[PDB]
């Protein structure tokens, strides 16, 4: 069996009522259920039989549908309830998953303040250079970051973090730390940082040059 | 000829935890007690453990007994081996070898052995934290860069607790090297650049690390 | 609280092998179909296997199918999922997931998970080596030497097989790293030091990155 | 419980030589011992699976005896296949314990080891890592000991060391010890060297170089 979910990302506003709707490929009658998902933590099960609500769960969360369509419906979101869900069907000795949608609380989109560091000279004579480019407070969550090093796109050797949604302002900030050796960082010159991101016309970049 | 075929070893940390495998080929665990043993770098075999037929009785050398857990699967015909929290001398070669004999009685020796899989335990079992600052280039960003400390958590505060609003301390990351690496940057006003003193206070409570770093102007 | 607790995660290579377990505590294990899930790079979950109650079936997602085998061992509570040839997209998350319901039925949501342990599957399935001269200081010694490299072996040769009197390579140590190291090493009449040439022919034979360095004086 | 005393810890002889072990148990047992060869880095092999009671497919030179207590194994004359490791080992019914393996290996004279030492190539130098490697040559019998020194500063826990086994031509062992440092910390100091000492050597040897010169 496979399944989809939509939307993959769902922006409300506190007290609202949404849906997220899971459609499989072939009937699975009502042998569907749904999952809440904290980042870091275990999924912790919400609706079975597609409408049973789990014994403790709140009445605001509800599942229907029957056959190929499904639908989760929360009635009221509070704070708690912006998470992961995932729709998943379940068999007498197996089980399959959709691709799960994101809750979020919705914002005007907002540009990341782009700021690119260099490495320390205490990190440096150590012989590992980490530059670190920060894309500050940004919304929607999704932003690309590019590193060029004279102009050389860079692949393999950076990774990334992303806060979760700020308590205050509702955005989003990413840090991007490219690591490479000391016998491999004096190479080259210019260290840029190129962003796209939904609030930006066009892509952002910072740069330095070595020393 | 019959074979065994280890699984799972490598690379540890002391006070870690892995779990070693054996497979089987041209025959059936189901009749046998299945054996763990080891040779440990001073040469010598040690043996480890060992799970009866019909997975009755369980028994261990008495340096990993309580420590070790022995397993079986008769169907699919694997024996399994946990190894909680590891001491540095649990380093050896890892052999499962079968209690065996053409026809079988209530004591035989060990008639089949597999190649054997490599277990070494790092005697490194916290490592403390190395920081960085990221020194700030209307308003400017800097922050502080730990860096190679095993395993999490990293709290980070600046100033002493002092200065909370703008300030993001990033999730970590797990680099190739095994160990992790975050981020904590803050914003401020541009002007305060000069007459602020902006501190990361930088607490690893598993090495029992603290190091608190000022972060300035080039 | 019903109590689960993963253990064996953390760093493999692609065409390597792990072997995750599960324990518990506050249920018994047996009367409950167990499971093991990912969570995939994109946020998305993933089932990956599935054994009855009994070890009666035992079912896979077709990525890992064939690759991974699921186990149970109920008289010490314990569930084991061993993967052989791991491959980057294997990189996730793993729980031990529970069937389950306040009053269990013949099909079930997973109700008890653990609180999960990651799985990294680096794609450095053949680490080509780093190849180093080992410089002559009546009989002089010189040597090639070689770090940082997966998996053995590396091989070494004295100028493509013209010189084997004297010669010896060494059993290779792995580093804290999780790399081999070794060394060749040869000795010869320090008179020849200025006439011949001396070379090492090298292959890292998994990854087949053939390399060759001169050796002379400094 | 049960300790196997096993003698010696290392047997030398050389080929067409007959050689006997003996295994010596620490409370008794019902002659429930059995005898083992390991070659280096491998899976042992059962060759008796009860005292005296070799094992089908072994070569017929083994043999062994036991007395409840007391327990020997002995080769025929050993072939230059027979030159590894031998281990005894008490089975009882859900454990096992072995005796500190007899080493048996190829005889000759005392020799002293050559000892060499080399700086990091230059090549290495600059990716960032300094490589220091010493050297034992060749020496016999394989028990030698490797101390390093940087600035006259006794060293800890910064060196892998391996043995090679026996060589084809001699039978003598050899050593190599690698000190590993970043260049950071290579650049620190001036000089780096190894003291050995060795059952063949009156007094330690040291070989040392000046970094840069
Ligand atoms: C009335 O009488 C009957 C007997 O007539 C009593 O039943 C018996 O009760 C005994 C005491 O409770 C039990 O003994 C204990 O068993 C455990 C587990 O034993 C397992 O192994 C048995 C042997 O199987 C070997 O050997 C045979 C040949 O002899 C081979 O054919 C076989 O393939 C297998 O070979 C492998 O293992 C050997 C080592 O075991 C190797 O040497 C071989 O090379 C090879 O690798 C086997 O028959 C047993 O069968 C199961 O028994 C379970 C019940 O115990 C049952 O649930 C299951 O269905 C099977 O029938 C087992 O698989 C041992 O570990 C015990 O050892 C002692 O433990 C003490 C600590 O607890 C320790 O102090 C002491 O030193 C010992 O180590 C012990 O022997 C019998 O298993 C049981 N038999 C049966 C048929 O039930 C009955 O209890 C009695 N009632 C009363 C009220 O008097
Ligand atoms: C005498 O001999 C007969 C026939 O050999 C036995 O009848 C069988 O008994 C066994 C055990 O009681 C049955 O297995 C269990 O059946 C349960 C219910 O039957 C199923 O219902 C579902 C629909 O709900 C159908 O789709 C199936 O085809 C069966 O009809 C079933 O719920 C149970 O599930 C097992 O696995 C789950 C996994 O979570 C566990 O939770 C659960 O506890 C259990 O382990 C089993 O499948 C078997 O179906 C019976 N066969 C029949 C119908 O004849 C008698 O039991 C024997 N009696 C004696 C004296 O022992
Ligand atoms: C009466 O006693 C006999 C033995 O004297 C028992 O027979 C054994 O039964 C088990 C369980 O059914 C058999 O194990 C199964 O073997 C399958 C493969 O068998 C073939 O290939 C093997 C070599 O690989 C040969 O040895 C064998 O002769 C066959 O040619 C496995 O694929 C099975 O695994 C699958 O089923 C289990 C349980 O459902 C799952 O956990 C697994 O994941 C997998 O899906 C299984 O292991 C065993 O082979 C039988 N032995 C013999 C000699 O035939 C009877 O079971 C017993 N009667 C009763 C009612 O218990």
């Known amino acids: 069996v496979v399944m989809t979910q939509s939307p993959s990302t769902l922006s409300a506003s506190v007290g609202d009522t949404i849906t997220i709707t899971c459609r499989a490929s072939?009937?699975?009658?009502?042998?569907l259920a749904w999952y809440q998902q904290k980042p870091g933590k275990a999924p912790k099960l919400l609706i079975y039989?597609?409408?049973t609500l789990k014994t403790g769960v709140p009445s605001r969360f509800s599942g229907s549908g029957s056959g190929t369509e499904f639908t989760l419906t929360i009635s009221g979101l509070q704070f708690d309830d912006f998470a992961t869900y995932h729709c998943?069907?379940?068999?007498?000795?197996?089980?399959?998953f959709g691709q799960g949608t994101r809750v979020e609380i919705k914002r005007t989109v907002a540009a990341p303040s782009v700021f690119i560091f260099p490495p320390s000279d205490e990190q440096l004579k150590s012989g590992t250079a980490s530059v670190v480019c920060l894309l500050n407070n940004f919304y929607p969550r999704e932003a690309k970051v590019q590193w060029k090093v004279d102009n050389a796109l860079q692949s393999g050797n950076s990774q990334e973090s992303v806060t979760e949604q700020d308590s205050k302002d509702s955005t989003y900030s990413l840090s991007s730390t490219l690591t490479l050796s000391k016998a491999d960082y004096e190479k080259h010159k210019v260290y840029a940082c190129e962003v796209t991101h939904q609030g930006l016309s066009s892509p952002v970049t910072k740069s330095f040059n070595r020393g | 000829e019959v074979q065994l075929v280890e699984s799972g070893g490598g690379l540890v940390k002391a006070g870690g935890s892995l779990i070693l495998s054996c497979?089987?080929?041209?025959?059936?665990?189901?009749?046998?007690?299945?054996?763990?043993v080891r040779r440990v770098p001073g040469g010598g075999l040690e043996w480890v453990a060992s799970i009866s037929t019909s997975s009755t009785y369980r028994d261990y050398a008495d340096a990993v007994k309580g420590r070790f857990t022995v397993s079986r699967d008769d169907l699919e015909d694997f024996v399994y081996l946990q190894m909680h929290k590891m001491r540095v001398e649990d380093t050896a070669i890892?052999?499962?070898?079968?209690?065996?004999?053409?026809?079988?009685?209530?004591?035989?020796?060990?008639?089949?052995?597999?190649?054997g899989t490599v277990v070494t335990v790092s005697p490194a079992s916290t490592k403390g934290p190395s920081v960085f600052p990221l020194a700030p280039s209307g308003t400017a960003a800097l922050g502080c860069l730990v860096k190679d400390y095993f395993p999490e958590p990293v709290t980070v505060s600046w100033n002493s607790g002092a200065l909370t609003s703008g300030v993001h301390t990033f999730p970590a990351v797990l680099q190739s090297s095994g160990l992790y690496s975050l981020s904590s940057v803050v914003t401020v006003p541009s002007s305060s650049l000069g007459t602020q003193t902006y501190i990361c206070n930088v607490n690893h409570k598993p090495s029992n690390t603290k190091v608190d770093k000022k972060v300035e102007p080039k | 609280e019903v109590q689960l607790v993963e253990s064996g995660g953390g760093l493999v290579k692609a065409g390597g092998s792990l072997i995750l377990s599960c324990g518990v505590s506050?249920?018994?294990?047996?009367?409950?179909?167990m499971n093991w899930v990912r969570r995939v790079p994109g946020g998305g979950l993933e089932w990956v296997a599935s054994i009855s109650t009994s070890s009666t079936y035992r079912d896979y997602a077709d990525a890992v199918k064939g690759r991974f085998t699921v186990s149970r061992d109920d008289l010490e509570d314990f569930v084991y999922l061993q993967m052989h040839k791991m491959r980057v997209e294997d990189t996730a998350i793993y729980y031990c997931?529970?069937?389950?319901?306040?009053?269990?039925?013949?099909?079930?949501?997973?109700?008890?998970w653990g609180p999960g342990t990651v799985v990294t599957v680096s794609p450095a399935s053949t680490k080509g080596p780093s190849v180093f001269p080992l410089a002559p200081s009546g009989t002089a010694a010189l040597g090639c030497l070689v770090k940082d490299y997966f998996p053995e072996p590396v091989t070494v040769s004295w100028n493509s097989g013209a010189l084997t009197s004297g010669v010896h390579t060494f059993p290779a140590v792995l580093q804290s790293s999780g790399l081999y190291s070794l060394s060749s090493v040869v000795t010869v009449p320090s008179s020849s030091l200025g006439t011949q040439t001396y070379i090492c022919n090298v292959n890292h034979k998994p990854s087949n990155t053939k390399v060759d360095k001169k050796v002379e004086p400094k | 419980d049960v300790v196997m005393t096993q003698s010696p810890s290392t047997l030398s002889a050389s080929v067409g030589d007959t050689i006997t072990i003996t295994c010596?148990?620490?409370?008794?047992?019902?002659?429930?011992?059995?005898?083992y060869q390991q070659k280096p880095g491998k899976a042992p092999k059962l060759?008796?699976?009860?005292?005296?009671?070799?094992?089908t497919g072994v070569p017929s030179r083994f043999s062994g005896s036991g007395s409840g207590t007391e327990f020997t194994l002995t080769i025929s004359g050993l072939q230059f296949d027979d030159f590894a490791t031998?281990?005894?080992?008490?089975?009882?019914?859900?454990?096992?314990?072995?005796?500190?393996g007899t080493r048996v290996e190829i005889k000759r004279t005392v020799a002293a080891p050559s000892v060499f030492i080399f700086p990091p190539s230059d090549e290495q130098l600059k990716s960032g890592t300094a490589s220091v490697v010493c050297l034992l040559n060749n020496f016999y019998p394989r028990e030698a000991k490797v101390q390093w020194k940087v600035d006259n500063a006794l060293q800890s826990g910064n060196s892998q060391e391996s043995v090679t086994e026996q060589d084809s031509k001699d039978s003598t062992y050899s050593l190599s010890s690698t000190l590993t440092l970043s260049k950071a910390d290579y650049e620190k100091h001036k000089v780096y060297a190894c003291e050995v000492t060795h059952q063949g050597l009156s007094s330690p040897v040291t070989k040392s170089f000046n970094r840069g010169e």
């Open positions: 072939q009937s699975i009658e009502t042998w």
């Open positions: 506050n249920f018994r294990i047996s009367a409950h179909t």
């Open positions: 039989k597609a409408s």
């Open positions: 998943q069907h379940y068999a007498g000795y197996s089980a399959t």
């Open positions: 997931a529970r069937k389950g319901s306040d009053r269990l039925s013949d099909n079930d949501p997973f109700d008890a």
